[PDB]
Amino acid sequence: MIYEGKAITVTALESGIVELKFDLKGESVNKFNRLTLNELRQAVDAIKADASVKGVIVSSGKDVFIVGADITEFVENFKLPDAELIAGNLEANKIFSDFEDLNVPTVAAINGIALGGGLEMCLAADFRVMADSAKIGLPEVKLGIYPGFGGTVRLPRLIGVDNAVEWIASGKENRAEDALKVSAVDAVVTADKLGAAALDLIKRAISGELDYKAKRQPKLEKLKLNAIEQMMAFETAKG
Amino acid sequence: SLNPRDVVIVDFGRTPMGRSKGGMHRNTRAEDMSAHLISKVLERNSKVDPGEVEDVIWGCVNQTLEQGWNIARMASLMTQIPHTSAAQTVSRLCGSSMSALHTAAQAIMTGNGDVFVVGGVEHMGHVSMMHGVDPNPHMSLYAAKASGMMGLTAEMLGKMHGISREQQDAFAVRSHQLAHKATVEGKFKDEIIPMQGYDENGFLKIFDYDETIRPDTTLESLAALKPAFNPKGGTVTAGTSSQITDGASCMIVMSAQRAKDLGLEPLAVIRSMAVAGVDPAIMGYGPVPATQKALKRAGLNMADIDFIELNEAFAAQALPVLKDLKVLDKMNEKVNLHGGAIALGHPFGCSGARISGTLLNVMKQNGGTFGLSTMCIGLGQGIATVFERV
Amino acid sequence: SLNPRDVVIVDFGRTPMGRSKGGMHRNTRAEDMSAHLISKVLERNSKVDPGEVEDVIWGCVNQTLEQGWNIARMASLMTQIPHTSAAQTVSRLCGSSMSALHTAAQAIMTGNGDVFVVGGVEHMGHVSMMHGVDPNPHMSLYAAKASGMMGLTAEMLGKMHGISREQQDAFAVRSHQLAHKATVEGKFKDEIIPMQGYDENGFLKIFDYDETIRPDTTLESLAALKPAFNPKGGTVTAGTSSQITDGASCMIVMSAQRAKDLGLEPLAVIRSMAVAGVDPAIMGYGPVPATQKALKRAGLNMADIDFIELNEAFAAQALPVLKDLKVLDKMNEKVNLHGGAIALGHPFGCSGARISGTLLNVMKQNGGTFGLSTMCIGLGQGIATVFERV
């Protein structure tokens, strides 16, 4: 195949479209540990070279989609000097950013729970399909921190300042219904039909039906809010 | 002289204001309140024929339940207005009623009607402003959700133009004071239409005054109040803001030519109409953009207007407007001399023509000529009008 | 020739209609549906500057929840339209959107603006027509409560002018038929703005057609249906009545002088505007009083209009109108040639300019000159307009 690791598998599909599944063999769930970050890196650089690629569908092999990294590694990482820590995320965000700047339509098939980095992964893609029985959120504040994988960057520009501030300041989980209303997700479908949901969406992006270049732009530019509107948008939020 | 195509205001009328909470209108529908007022104002002007009324443009905001399904027609049917007449409900939040006046005026100037009946109503007691409100998440992607809360948009301006608490409460007392003063000295008599209502015990009696006016308002009584929107650092309170009040306001309008035919003496003549927009976060600054576009379309200046009626939304929004209008030092001389919305209440749908009508009386009562009726609108909007006494 | 004061319609646009029940708009807010349409229609006309848009007059009826608090502005804020522009929500039930067109047109003729963006929306799926309705008992003292039920007002006219079931269903099939025909033969292509929606399974895809159109409609399929309002003796059914549909409609309108400046070719020019009233019990007879007052204000006759667009409220109301308009025998030649409301749905707030916009296309598509856009309104009302192709 195009790529094969211990937590990520990139299998080719029809019409050039290729699927990138997060399946951490051995463990029960998926999370961004030291390994996954490196494998995703290689996976991206692989799709970044393969010219036969016409689209990318990110799926999950486990029950849940992708949850936060091991709490154990968090502590170990929060002891390092500030300079070494920032470098860890500076290079980390680069991975997601690369998958974002990928000159090809990308869609995430959220079949299950997508928390912390998991949601940030999807936020990097262009479109997002979610199963009605799933939940997404950013429970970073439940640890005294906030989204470090571009979360505080893509969400505010995707669903709006206010709604983003809420999703972050609370760290609450979000149901399928609410996720769509805030546009954190582009479409909700039954679990079984979630498969074709992504495939059908991809083809409607490649042809040009769904301008993916225009849908990706918002999170690559300044907020649409006015300067005056910002003054209130944030100050009131702070207060 | 007056060209036949100009607009003429025959008479103005308004229902006695009343607290939405257990007030005099606690048992009166917004529909019946309007129909009753419209019918009464038509009686004082027995010269104009209800049948000639081309269209009845009413003002209303929270159109649902009692105020839903085109209340403009639901009220015109319980009056002397024939079923042959039309009726539309114009909504532009606070400036709803005023926009209605423009729709008719412009309908006259274009030969699409000779006689109109404009006005507005808003029974916040029944159809509260917080009833049936479904916020749009996507709105946060283009603006600040906080900009929706009128109270906070007042705070921002109160900080931008530096308006202190000692100043806001000072403007509040002025409103209650002048409102009560004008009331006692009989100045609202020509506009207030005696209306049946109920008191505390539930007795049936007719009110001809305004409950909303609290004479016992002092700088000390307001200073004891706490910020209603922003806890730590707030300056605007329920005392400086307008009141939740049930009430309507009617106004008979027609062409000047038809006025010379029915031999009825006008009350004022519309000269310029204007509407403008501002940032939702600071909607209180809407009056200035509207006034400017108004004076320009009338070939006048702020110095030509003898009297001004600025709807008192918040104390933290009115003052800033009057300051940037270069008429703040002329407040006690030509601005809300009979009282403001802070003491007379602010019926989302009635306030439009309500202040415009009161303005005409302030001019007629003091030999004025040019008047200014402006008001700020939610989500960043403003509207103004200039009437001439001739 | 065209005088600078005349009104000009630059472009017309409308969202793809869709069943309110589990349709393509089941997950689209009425606010976003409008803002999206307005934004797209402005793109096709890159010549007109969104900033010059004096005011955005939108149409809406059940203004609550999503459609409440002046949806006209709530939508204009999520577009390229600056905060400097104004926005009002006009309500006149079914003819809401059409009245909006008049307000703007008349605002132009009187020098109170140069560029306007009119239209309307009505998402009956979310904000159903039966949502938050509080009947006024006192209304029965001046009229019949039954007159409120649009269905019954159709029955009465169906008995007054003698319209049988075999005729009503015949008019229904005609609507579905012609609508489907025009659709397939690409006639709505210039007005339908591709819009994202969702199908049954919940997949995201773009619709460019009208779901509401059921081609398999026959006189037999309709005859199998039962009366929906009056059991024993009913003639009007859900098949002969309009459909509950989610959808909007936009229209860029400005002065003729400004058109000669931006060098953009018009689509039509407003000549006469009119509104009238009829008995609530027979509100379906509103078009005639409106059309007459319109033609007279344009110095024309029913014989001068080449094409007519009559909103198909009920089959029992449309036929009676066309009969008293002396054009019934001219139906298949100049009346709803691309389809009607029975197959395209009737969004209380969008239908106004929707049928008027379609009219302009029918004229341009067949070298027509004068067009007629009229429709009946609840509680006894009517509204019409005459556009000229030049």
Ligand SMILES: CC(=O)SCCNC(=O)CCNC(=O)[C@H](O)C(C)(C)COP(=O)(O)OP(=O)(O)OC[C@H]1O[C@@H](n2cnc3c(N)ncnc32)[C@H](O)[C@@H]1OP(=O)(O)O
């Ligand atoms: C853009 C435009 O044109 S307008 C925008 C529209 N905005 C408005 O109309 C203002 C909105 N305001 C509101 O909705 C309400 O007033 C709120 C939410 C701010 C406050 O409501 P609540 O939480 O119920 O507090 P409440 O209004 O009851 O407070 C009033 C208190 O002040 C006291 N008070 C009011 N005026 C005075 C006075 N002049 N002197 C002394 N006490 C006073 C009252 O006695 C009362 O006290 P009590 O509750 O012990 O009896």
Ligand SMILES: CC(=O)SCCNC(=O)CCNC(=O)[C@H](O)C(C)(C)COP(=O)(O)OP(=O)(O)OC[C@H]1O[C@@H](n2cnc3c(N)ncnc32)[C@H](O)[C@@H]1OP(=O)(O)O
């Ligand atoms: C004044 C003006 O300008 S407009 C006046 C406003 N118009 C109206 O109020 C009428 C709009 N119509 C409605 O609101 C509704 O259709 C009603 C109230 C008439 C009926 O509503 P309901 O009780 O839900 O019945 P419903 O609409 O679902 O239709 C019932 C059946 O008729 C069928 N049907 C409806 N229209 C058609 C048609 N054109 N062809 C074939 N079958 C049809 C439906 O498929 C359905 O069949 P099913 O039971 O097997 O599913």
